[PDB]
Amino acid sequence: TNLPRNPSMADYEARIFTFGTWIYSVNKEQLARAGFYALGEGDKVKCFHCGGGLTDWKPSEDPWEQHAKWYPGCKYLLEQKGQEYINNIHLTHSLEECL
Ligand SMILES: CC[C@H](NC)C(=O)N[C@@H]1C(=O)N2[C@@H](CC[C@@H]1CO)CC[C@H]2C(=O)NCc1ccc(C(C)(C)C)cc1
Ligand SMILES: [Zn+2]
């Protein structure tokens, strides 16, 4: 049902390879472990499983967190971090708006 959108990038090694020319603050090993691979069009990266694309990284920012924040539907994310992790990121935002 929920098959990788890009099965060619399903291996960690495939993904890190893409970060050859990586010159940006955010750690390429962390991006890769969170399912992303670089597009060589700035700091743009894309999730191999959900196909979600992300840009304009700041130095502090966590790939996993951003993955959940923007693309919580990903099956890879769910297998790797679980329901609670994803829902936690979203409830956190709701509490911020509430108080
Ligand atoms: C990476 C964290 C960063 N920190 C501000 C950030 O939140 N970026 C976001 C961010 O990158 N976002 C979100 C909205 C904008 C924000 C602010 O830019 C949701 C879509 C995503 C976004 O604009 N992605 C650009 C993008 C979309 C698609 C693609 C493709 C088509 C997968 C190749 C590449 C790049
Ligand atoms: Zn994903």
XYZ file of all heavy atoms in Angstrom:
843
model
N 0.860 -1.218 0.000
C 0.000 0.000 0.000
C 0.888 1.258 0.000
O 0.744 2.084 -0.915
C -1.051 -0.070 1.123
O -1.727 1.188 1.213
C -0.480 -0.415 2.481
N 1.761 1.408 1.015
C 2.651 2.559 1.187
C 4.092 2.184 0.849
O 4.899 1.949 1.735
C 2.596 3.132 2.608
C 1.294 3.847 2.881
O 0.620 3.566 3.861
N 0.915 4.738 1.989
N 4.381 2.143 -0.454
C 5.672 1.731 -0.982
C 6.573 2.950 -1.151
O 6.086 4.055 -1.361
C 5.409 1.021 -2.307
C 4.807 -0.381 -2.155
C 4.028 -0.814 -3.392
C 5.912 -1.360 -1.808
N 7.908 2.805 -1.048
C 8.783 3.964 -1.183
C 8.507 4.664 -2.514
O 8.352 3.995 -3.560
C 10.201 3.383 -1.115
C 10.014 2.073 -0.363
C 8.634 1.562 -0.757
N 8.449 5.995 -2.470
C 8.232 6.802 -3.619
C 9.475 6.751 -4.532
O 9.368 6.993 -5.729
C 7.873 8.217 -3.124
C 7.747 9.310 -4.178
C 6.326 9.826 -4.412
N 6.229 11.272 -4.274
C 5.312 11.896 -3.562
N 4.426 11.161 -2.898
N 5.269 13.226 -3.610
N 10.645 6.460 -3.954
C 11.901 6.390 -4.704
C 12.738 5.214 -4.180
O 13.753 5.413 -3.515
C 12.671 7.715 -4.625
C 12.027 8.894 -5.308
O 12.388 10.044 -5.002
N 11.219 8.650 -6.321
N 12.374 3.953 -4.509
C 13.038 2.781 -3.948
C 14.555 2.711 -4.215
O 15.256 1.981 -3.530
C 12.373 1.607 -4.694
C 11.045 2.142 -5.100
C 11.337 3.584 -5.472
N 15.035 3.474 -5.194
C 16.448 3.545 -5.526
C 17.256 4.220 -4.399
O 18.467 3.997 -4.284
C 16.648 4.247 -6.849
O 16.623 5.660 -6.679
N 16.593 5.043 -3.566
C 17.262 5.795 -2.504
C 16.960 5.198 -1.115
O 17.186 5.850 -0.080
C 16.849 7.268 -2.587
C 17.490 7.993 -3.783
S 19.289 8.131 -3.631
C 19.656 9.205 -5.001
N 16.512 3.937 -1.086
C 16.044 3.275 0.142
C 17.212 2.871 1.052
O 16.990 2.589 2.228
C 15.191 2.080 -0.195
N 18.438 2.842 0.517
C 19.637 2.496 1.304
C 20.303 3.778 1.812
O 20.379 4.780 1.087
C 20.649 1.668 0.502
C 20.187 0.256 0.194
O 19.429 -0.315 0.995
O 20.589 -0.261 -0.856
N 20.803 3.718 3.051
C 21.506 4.826 3.675
C 22.668 5.286 2.770
O 22.864 6.484 2.555
C 21.974 4.429 5.083
C 22.833 5.471 5.754
C 22.265 6.593 6.325
C 24.217 5.375 5.758
C 23.038 7.575 6.919
C 25.005 6.360 6.335
C 24.417 7.463 6.924
O 25.194 8.421 7.505
N 23.412 4.313 2.235
C 24.636 4.524 1.449
C 24.302 5.319 0.182
O 24.995 6.288 -0.149
C 25.301 3.197 1.065
C 25.677 2.339 2.265
C 24.624 1.360 2.776
O 23.357 1.628 2.651
O 25.057 0.353 3.318
N 23.235 4.905 -0.518
C 22.745 5.646 -1.674
C 22.555 7.122 -1.293
O 22.976 8.029 -2.024
C 21.464 5.029 -2.185
N 21.941 7.349 -0.129
C 21.515 8.676 0.274
C 22.732 9.548 0.602
O 22.822 10.658 0.082
C 20.487 8.591 1.411
C 19.150 7.999 0.986
C 17.991 8.316 1.919
N 18.197 7.822 3.271
C 17.930 6.587 3.668
N 17.452 5.698 2.803
N 18.135 6.248 4.935
N 23.635 9.056 1.459
C 24.850 9.837 1.870
C 25.652 10.226 0.626
O 26.154 11.348 0.567
C 25.767 9.123 2.885
C 25.873 7.616 2.638
C 25.356 9.450 4.314
C 27.152 7.193 1.973
N 25.747 9.304 -0.343
C 26.487 9.536 -1.581
C 26.085 10.887 -2.184
O 26.946 11.666 -2.600
C 26.301 8.380 -2.565
C 26.895 7.064 -2.117
C 26.481 5.879 -2.708
C 27.840 6.984 -1.099
C 26.984 4.652 -2.290
C 28.331 5.761 -0.669
C 27.919 4.598 -1.274
N 24.782 11.173 -2.181
C 24.224 12.405 -2.770
C 24.779 13.673 -2.094
O 24.731 14.746 -2.696
C 22.686 12.408 -2.729
O 22.255 12.643 -1.382
C 22.076 11.125 -3.267
N 25.282 13.562 -0.861
C 25.772 14.722 -0.095
C 27.291 14.919 -0.270
O 27.939 15.511 0.571
C 25.420 14.594 1.389
C 23.942 14.563 1.701
C 23.244 13.368 1.639
C 23.257 15.716 2.093
C 21.900 13.317 1.984
C 21.897 15.675 2.355
C 21.219 14.479 2.315
N 27.844 14.432 -1.385
C 29.218 14.684 -1.787
C 29.596 16.143 -1.676
O 30.556 16.454 -0.982
N 28.838 17.027 -2.343
C 29.176 18.483 -2.412
C 28.412 19.268 -1.336
O 27.905 20.350 -1.610
C 28.913 19.055 -3.811
O 29.566 18.195 -4.737
C 29.479 20.436 -4.042
N 28.337 18.725 -0.114
C 27.474 19.313 0.932
C 28.261 20.344 1.752
O 29.248 19.992 2.397
C 26.840 18.227 1.822
C 25.709 18.755 2.659
C 25.712 19.048 3.998
C 24.401 19.120 2.183
N 24.496 19.552 4.383
C 23.673 19.608 3.289
C 23.772 19.080 0.934
C 22.356 20.051 3.177
C 22.470 19.499 0.827
C 21.773 19.979 1.934
N 27.765 21.588 1.746
C 28.468 22.756 2.287
C 27.579 23.545 3.255
O 27.837 24.720 3.495
C 28.958 23.656 1.135
C 27.817 24.165 0.254
C 30.016 22.941 0.319
C 27.381 25.585 0.551
N 26.557 22.900 3.817
C 25.539 23.584 4.625
C 25.613 23.104 6.079
O 26.103 22.003 6.358
C 24.144 23.365 4.031
C 23.955 23.965 2.661
C 24.095 23.193 1.514
C 23.637 25.307 2.510
C 23.947 23.746 0.254
C 23.472 25.871 1.252
C 23.626 25.085 0.118
O 23.479 25.622 -1.132
N 25.090 23.940 6.979
C 25.234 23.779 8.423
C 24.806 22.377 8.891
O 25.477 21.777 9.716
C 24.455 24.862 9.168
O 23.184 25.096 8.565
N 23.692 21.868 8.360
C 23.015 20.705 8.916
C 23.725 19.413 8.486
O 24.057 19.210 7.329
C 21.518 20.680 8.550
C 20.764 21.757 9.310
C 21.244 20.824 7.059
N 23.903 18.515 9.456
C 24.746 17.356 9.311
C 24.147 16.420 8.255
O 22.989 16.009 8.362
C 24.938 16.633 10.648
C 25.786 15.389 10.513
O 25.432 14.334 11.034
N 26.891 15.485 9.790
N 24.978 16.063 7.264
C 24.575 15.234 6.132
C 24.254 13.796 6.585
O 23.441 13.122 5.957
C 25.646 15.287 5.036
C 27.032 14.782 5.416
C 27.398 13.502 4.691
C 28.879 13.398 4.376
N 29.314 14.375 3.347
N 24.895 13.318 7.659
C 24.643 11.955 8.154
C 23.249 11.890 8.799
O 22.562 10.865 8.712
C 25.718 11.508 9.147
C 26.993 10.984 8.507
C 28.028 12.028 8.125
O 28.162 13.045 8.851
O 28.752 11.782 7.143
N 22.849 12.992 9.454
C 21.559 13.086 10.126
C 20.442 13.161 9.075
O 19.445 12.431 9.174
C 21.519 14.285 11.079
C 22.130 14.018 12.453
C 22.101 15.243 13.346
O 21.497 15.270 14.434
N 22.787 16.281 12.895
N 20.619 14.031 8.073
C 19.689 14.140 6.943
C 19.472 12.761 6.301
O 18.357 12.346 6.028
C 20.242 15.138 5.925
C 20.156 16.607 6.359
C 21.092 17.486 5.535
C 18.748 17.132 6.259
N 20.559 12.035 6.083
C 20.492 10.790 5.372
C 19.765 9.735 6.212
O 19.029 8.909 5.678
C 21.885 10.344 5.006
N 20.020 9.748 7.525
C 19.460 8.738 8.430
C 17.941 8.955 8.549
O 17.186 8.005 8.744
C 20.154 8.783 9.798
C 21.162 7.672 10.065
C 21.956 7.862 11.365
N 23.304 8.413 11.197
C 24.287 8.317 12.092
N 24.059 7.775 13.278
N 25.500 8.751 11.791
N 17.510 10.212 8.399
C 16.100 10.612 8.474
C 15.387 10.409 7.117
O 14.238 10.822 6.952
C 16.022 12.039 8.939
N 16.066 9.777 6.154
C 15.467 9.308 4.910
C 15.689 10.257 3.744
O 15.223 9.984 2.639
N 16.406 11.359 3.973
C 16.590 12.369 2.953
C 17.820 12.069 2.083
O 18.707 11.325 2.470
C 16.701 13.758 3.582
C 15.498 14.208 4.372
C 15.464 14.075 5.757
C 14.405 14.779 3.742
C 14.359 14.486 6.483
C 13.297 15.184 4.466
C 13.285 15.055 5.833
N 17.827 12.660 0.882
C 18.939 12.686 -0.065
C 18.905 14.029 -0.797
O 17.844 14.590 -0.996
C 18.854 11.466 -0.975
C 17.697 11.452 -1.925
C 17.907 11.818 -3.236
C 16.412 11.071 -1.557
C 16.875 11.854 -4.164
C 15.361 11.115 -2.460
C 15.590 11.534 -3.768
O 14.619 11.519 -4.729
N 20.085 14.564 -1.111
C 20.219 15.907 -1.698
C 19.904 15.862 -3.192
O 20.080 14.837 -3.842
C 21.600 16.459 -1.430
N 19.449 17.002 -3.707
C 19.032 17.153 -5.093
C 20.083 17.924 -5.906
O 19.957 18.022 -7.125
C 17.689 17.891 -5.110
C 16.540 17.178 -4.400
C 15.272 17.998 -4.501
C 16.328 15.768 -4.956
N 21.106 18.453 -5.224
C 22.120 19.300 -5.834
C 21.516 20.555 -6.434
O 21.874 20.932 -7.539
N 20.594 21.184 -5.701
C 19.930 22.403 -6.136
C 19.778 23.273 -4.886
O 18.662 23.654 -4.495
C 18.609 22.093 -6.853
C 18.442 22.824 -8.175
C 17.411 23.943 -8.208
O 17.344 24.767 -7.270
O 16.666 23.979 -9.180
N 20.924 23.602 -4.283
C 20.973 24.313 -3.013
C 21.027 23.319 -1.866
O 21.694 22.272 -1.977
N 20.293 23.626 -0.787
C 20.188 22.722 0.380
C 18.917 21.853 0.302
O 18.602 21.168 1.256
C 20.250 23.498 1.706
C 19.055 24.373 1.984
O 18.182 24.481 1.114
O 19.008 24.927 3.097
N 18.216 21.884 -0.833
C 17.032 21.046 -1.085
C 17.371 19.563 -0.859
O 18.355 19.053 -1.371
C 16.510 21.219 -2.513
C 15.714 22.486 -2.772
C 14.978 22.494 -4.095
C 14.280 23.818 -4.323
N 14.327 24.261 -5.739
N 16.519 18.886 -0.081
C 16.562 17.445 0.100
C 15.138 16.903 0.005
O 14.187 17.654 0.089
C 17.204 17.063 1.444
C 18.619 17.607 1.552
C 16.371 17.520 2.643
N 15.036 15.585 -0.137
C 13.813 14.909 -0.441
C 13.816 13.552 0.274
O 14.846 12.893 0.330
C 13.709 14.714 -1.960
C 12.330 14.299 -2.484
C 12.320 14.004 -3.949
C 11.078 13.269 -4.376
N 11.187 12.707 -5.749
N 12.670 13.152 0.821
C 12.563 11.884 1.510
C 12.345 10.784 0.468
O 11.491 10.897 -0.388
C 11.469 11.898 2.576
S 11.125 10.275 3.307
N 13.132 9.719 0.554
C 13.029 8.636 -0.400
C 11.669 7.931 -0.291
O 11.195 7.310 -1.241
C 14.131 7.616 -0.171
C 13.836 6.587 0.883
C 13.255 5.381 0.541
C 14.140 6.826 2.216
C 12.993 4.426 1.514
C 13.873 5.866 3.185
C 13.302 4.667 2.834
N 11.050 7.983 0.884
C 9.850 7.205 1.117
C 8.582 8.029 0.866
O 7.721 7.583 0.139
C 9.842 6.594 2.507
C 8.923 5.429 2.566
N 7.567 5.596 2.524
C 9.156 4.093 2.615
C 6.994 4.417 2.616
N 7.946 3.458 2.645
N 8.465 9.201 1.463
C 7.246 10.030 1.348
C 7.372 11.002 0.171
O 6.374 11.589 -0.259
C 6.922 10.771 2.645
S 8.169 11.983 3.164
N 8.594 11.195 -0.329
C 8.856 12.173 -1.387
C 8.805 13.638 -0.912
O 8.837 14.559 -1.731
N 8.743 13.865 0.400
C 8.679 15.202 0.917
C 9.967 15.969 0.716
O 11.029 15.439 0.968
N 9.860 17.228 0.307
C 11.015 18.073 0.041
C 11.118 19.243 1.007
O 10.138 19.869 1.309
N 12.346 19.534 1.439
C 12.682 20.498 2.494
C 13.885 21.356 2.051
O 14.798 20.871 1.418
C 13.025 19.695 3.759
C 12.020 19.707 4.896
C 10.607 19.944 4.429
C 12.137 18.433 5.705
N 13.879 22.631 2.465
C 14.887 23.642 2.114
C 15.041 24.639 3.263
O 14.255 24.642 4.166
C 14.493 24.434 0.854
O 15.618 25.195 0.433
C 13.287 25.330 1.029
N 16.041 25.520 3.134
C 16.298 26.651 4.049
C 16.552 26.139 5.471
O 15.980 26.632 6.426
C 15.147 27.671 4.005
C 15.562 29.086 4.375
O 16.338 29.669 3.593
O 15.135 29.580 5.458
N 17.437 25.149 5.598
C 17.795 24.597 6.907
C 18.521 25.654 7.742
O 19.235 26.454 7.203
C 18.646 23.337 6.730
C 17.919 22.203 6.079
C 17.839 21.939 4.744
C 17.212 21.135 6.735
N 17.103 20.800 4.521
C 16.698 20.295 5.727
C 16.949 20.826 8.071
C 15.963 19.150 6.017
C 16.216 19.698 8.358
C 15.726 18.877 7.346
N 18.299 25.647 9.054
C 19.077 26.432 10.028
C 20.019 25.469 10.741
O 19.822 24.256 10.679
C 18.156 27.145 11.030
C 16.981 27.904 10.424
C 17.385 29.163 9.689
C 16.244 29.772 8.906
N 16.600 31.135 8.463
N 21.096 25.957 11.397
C 22.097 25.073 12.010
C 21.586 24.142 13.131
O 22.029 22.994 13.231
C 23.128 26.062 12.588
C 22.377 27.380 12.718
C 21.443 27.382 11.531
N 20.667 24.648 13.962
C 20.130 23.912 15.118
C 19.219 22.738 14.699
O 19.107 21.759 15.432
C 19.377 24.857 16.020
O 18.390 25.575 15.281
N 18.576 22.843 13.528
C 17.318 22.139 13.217
C 17.560 20.641 13.010
O 18.560 20.252 12.412
C 16.654 22.770 11.995
C 15.954 24.077 12.318
C 15.203 24.700 11.152
O 15.633 24.492 10.003
O 14.172 25.379 11.393
N 16.627 19.823 13.515
C 16.752 18.367 13.510
C 15.998 17.815 12.303
O 14.812 18.097 12.118
C 16.253 17.743 14.820
C 16.422 16.230 14.904
O 17.209 15.658 14.106
O 15.759 15.614 15.763
N 16.678 17.041 11.424
C 16.022 16.417 10.275
C 14.763 15.644 10.652
O 13.730 15.821 10.027
C 17.101 15.467 9.735
C 18.383 16.221 10.038
C 18.136 16.814 11.418
N 14.878 14.799 11.669
C 13.776 13.983 12.114
C 12.592 14.857 12.522
O 11.459 14.573 12.181
C 14.236 13.112 13.266
C 14.903 11.836 12.861
C 16.104 11.373 13.305
C 14.365 10.805 12.017
N 16.348 10.130 12.797
C 15.304 9.756 12.001
C 13.201 10.673 11.255
C 15.121 8.599 11.252
C 13.013 9.521 10.521
C 13.962 8.500 10.524
N 12.868 15.923 13.249
C 11.815 16.791 13.733
C 11.119 17.444 12.543
O 9.902 17.477 12.474
C 12.349 17.872 14.667
C 12.686 17.340 16.047
C 13.047 18.393 17.064
O 13.279 19.546 16.655
O 13.050 18.046 18.270
N 11.909 17.961 11.611
C 11.364 18.655 10.457
C 10.584 17.651 9.581
O 9.533 17.973 9.025
C 12.488 19.358 9.699
C 13.186 20.449 10.503
C 12.258 21.488 11.055
O 11.375 22.014 10.388
N 12.472 21.786 12.314
N 11.086 16.415 9.478
C 10.409 15.394 8.731
C 8.990 15.219 9.278
O 8.026 15.207 8.521
C 11.187 14.077 8.785
C 10.829 13.122 7.692
N 11.657 12.099 7.311
C 9.739 13.019 6.904
C 11.087 11.387 6.358
N 9.930 11.948 6.071
N 8.887 15.072 10.601
C 7.617 14.912 11.285
C 6.765 16.190 11.177
O 5.557 16.109 11.015
C 7.872 14.556 12.715
N 7.397 17.367 11.305
C 6.650 18.600 11.332
C 5.891 18.801 10.016
O 4.766 19.269 10.031
C 7.579 19.793 11.550
C 6.895 21.156 11.549
C 7.820 22.290 11.835
C 7.114 23.609 11.660
N 8.039 24.724 11.955
N 6.532 18.469 8.886
C 6.060 18.868 7.548
C 5.433 17.690 6.783
O 4.533 17.907 5.949
C 7.200 19.465 6.741
C 7.720 20.743 7.319
C 8.948 20.948 7.881
C 7.037 22.004 7.381
N 9.068 22.248 8.295
C 7.921 22.923 7.988
C 5.778 22.456 6.960
C 7.575 24.251 8.213
C 5.435 23.775 7.178
C 6.330 24.660 7.787
N 5.898 16.461 7.067
C 5.491 15.296 6.347
C 5.203 14.141 7.295
O 5.773 13.062 7.154
C 6.576 14.929 5.337
C 6.829 16.000 4.316
C 8.018 16.713 4.294
C 5.857 16.320 3.382
C 8.219 17.720 3.372
C 6.068 17.309 2.434
C 7.253 18.022 2.431
O 7.470 19.003 1.505
N 4.259 14.305 8.236
C 4.007 13.293 9.263
C 3.421 11.988 8.751
O 3.357 10.991 9.491
C 2.972 13.969 10.178
C 2.291 14.987 9.292
C 3.402 15.487 8.396
N 3.025 11.994 7.473
C 2.410 10.827 6.849
C 3.392 9.724 6.479
O 2.973 8.609 6.261
N 4.688 10.037 6.412
C 5.715 9.101 5.937
C 5.722 7.780 6.718
O 5.727 7.770 7.913
C 7.079 9.757 6.025
S 8.412 8.748 5.335
N 5.749 6.652 6.006
C 5.820 5.323 6.620
C 7.208 5.051 7.191
O 7.358 4.370 8.181
C 5.484 4.217 5.625
C 5.332 2.834 6.244
C 5.571 1.657 5.342
C 5.068 0.392 5.999
N 4.573 -0.583 5.005
N 8.234 5.557 6.541
C 9.597 5.380 7.006
C 9.721 6.055 8.375
O 10.133 5.421 9.358
C 10.604 5.930 6.004
C 12.035 5.913 6.457
C 12.728 4.721 6.606
C 12.697 7.100 6.737
C 14.050 4.707 7.028
C 14.021 7.104 7.143
C 14.691 5.905 7.301
O 15.980 5.932 7.731
N 9.299 7.320 8.439
C 9.240 8.085 9.680
C 8.522 7.282 10.769
O 9.016 7.177 11.869
C 8.495 9.391 9.402
C 8.367 10.366 10.551
C 9.730 10.843 11.008
C 7.513 11.548 10.115
N 7.372 6.696 10.437
C 6.574 5.975 11.414
C 7.319 4.709 11.882
O 7.269 4.376 13.051
C 5.222 5.606 10.795
C 4.303 4.716 11.627
C 3.913 5.458 12.858
C 3.082 4.291 10.840
N 7.966 3.985 10.962
C 8.692 2.783 11.326
C 9.897 3.154 12.197
O 10.266 2.408 13.086
C 9.171 2.022 10.096
C 8.093 1.232 9.387
C 8.558 0.641 8.061
O 9.473 1.230 7.420
O 8.030 -0.428 7.679
N 10.516 4.307 11.923
C 11.760 4.685 12.555
C 11.509 5.334 13.920
O 12.263 5.076 14.826
C 12.554 5.609 11.636
C 13.090 4.896 10.397
C 13.988 3.727 10.732
O 14.991 3.867 11.429
N 13.647 2.567 10.212
N 10.472 6.170 14.059
C 10.322 7.037 15.243
C 9.031 6.760 16.022
O 8.918 7.148 17.175
C 10.305 8.499 14.816
C 11.467 8.929 13.930
C 12.786 8.822 14.630
C 12.970 9.953 15.615
N 14.236 9.825 16.375
N 8.024 6.175 15.375
C 6.768 5.777 16.006
C 5.730 6.877 16.011
O 6.051 8.069 15.889
N 4.484 6.458 16.291
C 3.295 7.306 16.307
C 3.497 8.497 17.238
O 3.221 9.653 16.887
C 2.082 6.551 16.854
C 1.646 5.341 16.054
C 0.324 4.781 16.516
O -0.219 5.147 17.563
N -0.206 3.863 15.728
N 3.974 8.178 18.433
C 4.008 9.044 19.593
C 4.944 10.215 19.256
O 4.628 11.357 19.514
C 4.528 8.296 20.836
C 4.177 6.806 20.923
C 2.708 6.533 21.053
O 1.950 7.474 21.372
O 2.351 5.389 20.805
N 6.101 9.905 18.663
C 7.073 10.901 18.273
C 6.431 11.900 17.312
O 6.583 13.128 17.481
C 8.324 10.268 17.666
C 9.333 11.275 17.183
C 10.237 11.870 18.044
C 9.346 11.673 15.863
C 11.149 12.812 17.594
C 10.252 12.614 15.398
C 11.152 13.197 16.268
O 12.043 14.122 15.797
N 5.721 11.388 16.308
C 5.181 12.259 15.295
C 4.078 13.125 15.910
O 4.117 14.380 15.846
C 4.688 11.457 14.093
C 5.748 10.528 13.505
C 4.178 12.435 13.069
C 5.225 9.516 12.519
N 3.113 12.462 16.556
C 1.989 13.135 17.159
C 2.489 14.132 18.203
O 1.902 15.190 18.373
C 0.970 12.135 17.706
C 0.252 11.376 16.602
O 0.063 11.911 15.500
N -0.112 10.123 16.873
N 3.589 13.808 18.877
C 4.134 14.693 19.899
C 4.529 16.005 19.246
O 4.198 17.052 19.767
C 5.321 14.089 20.647
C 4.918 13.191 21.795
O 3.735 13.013 22.071
N 5.906 12.542 22.398
N 5.212 15.945 18.096
C 5.668 17.147 17.423
C 4.447 18.025 17.113
O 4.506 19.246 17.256
C 6.428 16.808 16.130
C 7.602 15.844 16.354
C 6.804 18.073 15.380
C 8.852 16.456 16.866
N 3.333 17.398 16.703
C 2.171 18.160 16.264
C 1.397 18.726 17.469
O 0.924 19.850 17.425
C 1.351 17.322 15.303
C 1.957 17.391 13.952
N 1.604 18.348 13.052
C 3.007 16.728 13.408
C 2.324 18.186 11.952
N 3.199 17.186 12.140
N 1.285 17.948 18.551
C 0.596 18.412 19.731
C 1.372 19.567 20.359
O 0.778 20.495 20.883
C 0.432 17.263 20.724
C -0.480 16.133 20.239
C -0.552 15.022 21.276
C -1.878 16.631 19.870
N 2.706 19.488 20.324
C 3.535 20.551 20.827
C 3.086 21.883 20.218
O 2.841 22.821 20.973
C 5.014 20.229 20.620
O 5.298 19.058 21.382
C 5.943 21.330 21.080
N 2.955 21.933 18.887
C 2.531 23.151 18.175
C 1.153 23.637 18.667
O 0.966 24.827 18.911
C 2.568 22.957 16.648
C 2.075 24.138 15.870
N 2.849 25.271 15.672
C 0.901 24.362 15.228
C 2.149 26.162 14.999
N 0.936 25.640 14.736
N 0.199 22.711 18.793
C -1.181 23.009 19.242
C -1.197 23.642 20.644
O -2.028 24.510 20.909
C -2.033 21.764 19.214
O -2.278 21.357 17.881
N -0.307 23.187 21.536
C -0.215 23.725 22.892
C 0.338 25.158 22.868
O -0.092 26.008 23.638
C 0.689 22.831 23.744
C 0.009 22.001 24.830
C 1.055 21.181 25.556
C -0.767 22.835 25.853
N 1.323 25.391 21.994
C 1.915 26.706 21.768
C 0.826 27.707 21.363
O 0.768 28.790 21.931
C 2.984 26.602 20.686
C 3.902 27.803 20.540
C 4.901 27.605 19.408
O 5.412 26.474 19.317
O 5.157 28.560 18.599
N -0.016 27.337 20.380
C -1.097 28.199 19.894
C -2.134 28.406 21.004
O -2.652 29.509 21.138
C -1.736 27.642 18.622
C -1.486 28.539 17.427
C -1.678 27.870 16.082
O -1.209 26.736 15.916
O -2.318 28.488 15.214
N -2.427 27.351 21.775
C -3.399 27.404 22.870
C -2.961 28.407 23.957
O -3.745 29.280 24.334
C -3.613 26.024 23.479
S -4.954 25.987 24.695
N -1.739 28.269 24.485
C -1.217 29.148 25.537
C -0.350 30.249 24.907
O -0.848 31.271 24.425
C -0.413 28.305 26.537
C -1.219 27.614 27.641
C -0.766 26.173 27.822
C -1.131 28.378 28.962
C 14.050 22.619 6.665
C 13.462 23.293 7.877
C 13.312 24.737 7.409
N 13.556 25.563 8.562
C 12.984 26.895 8.361
C 11.868 24.846 6.939
O 10.947 24.789 7.749
N 11.602 24.894 5.644
C 10.188 24.750 5.262
C 10.102 24.012 4.076
O 11.131 23.680 3.495
N 8.972 23.561 3.577
C 7.739 23.777 4.289
C 7.155 25.162 4.160
C 8.243 26.235 4.222
C 9.258 26.094 5.358
C 10.026 27.410 5.475
O 10.894 27.435 4.348
C 6.826 22.753 3.719
C 7.257 22.612 2.292
C 8.733 22.758 2.396
C 9.212 23.409 1.210
O 8.948 24.588 0.944
N 9.972 22.624 0.427
C 10.572 23.034 -0.856
C 10.653 21.899 -1.688
C 9.499 21.238 -2.065
C 9.585 20.141 -2.922
C 10.772 19.646 -3.474
C 10.730 18.507 -4.341
C 9.632 18.666 -5.425
C 10.496 17.264 -3.501
C 12.023 18.225 -5.100
C 11.928 20.293 -3.087
C 11.856 21.408 -2.224
Zn 9.313 10.754 4.577
